[PDB]
Design a protein around this ligand. Structure first.
Ligand SMILES: [Zn+2]
Lengths: 65, 49, 50
């Protein structure tokens, strides 16, 4: 649904690096170089950000509003 | 109240649509306001969605 | 088929970009259509594609 704040394995703060990651996707950066520039050395945070699906906007499209 | 006709991006259409942790306001209790200076008690990253 | 007829036909539904032909925006998005992802009117989509 939404990006988790904490990483499951280590616990590094990763929720604040989601939208900026999207910006790196709006830019010309690929996945690997963007994850490297974000400061994710260990592969657990890379899996957390890469394998995450942004379903919050799809649900808000069905929100009452 | 002021936006473009299309405004496809949610940033222009809506305001405060993403509740970041910066909106958190520390409410002092008792004498915590005097002991802790302003700006010390706050979220760490200030950008967590 | 003669080349002049094909040229006249493509001039009404396409535009010239770098020597190639790209279909017009209104052809892909009719006046009653909308964006399948955002739901904005087709006029904005045509302006953006132009
Ligand atoms: Zn991690």
């Amino acid at each position: 649904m939404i990006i988790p704040v904490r990483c499951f394995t280590c616990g590094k703060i990763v929720g604040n690096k989601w939208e900026a990651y999207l910006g790196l996707l709006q830019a010309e950066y690929t996945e690997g170089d963007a994850l490297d520039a974000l400061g994710l050395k260990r592969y657990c945070c890379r899996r957390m950000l890469l394998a995450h699906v942004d379903l919050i906007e799809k649900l808000l499209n069905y929100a009452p509003l | 109240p002021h936006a473009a006709k299309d405004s496809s991006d949610p940033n222009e259409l809506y305001v405060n649509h993403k509740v970041y942790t910066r909106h958190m306001t520390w409410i002092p209790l008792g004498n915590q306001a005097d002991l802790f200076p302003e700006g010390t008690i706050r979220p760490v990253h200030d950008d967590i969605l | 088929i003669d080349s002049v007829a094909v040229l006249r036909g493509i001039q009404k539904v396409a535009m010239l970009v770098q020597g190639n032909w790209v279909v017009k925006s209104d052809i892909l998005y009719p006046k009653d259509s909308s964006s399948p992802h955002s739901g904005v009117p087709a006029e904005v989509l045509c302006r953006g594609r132009d």
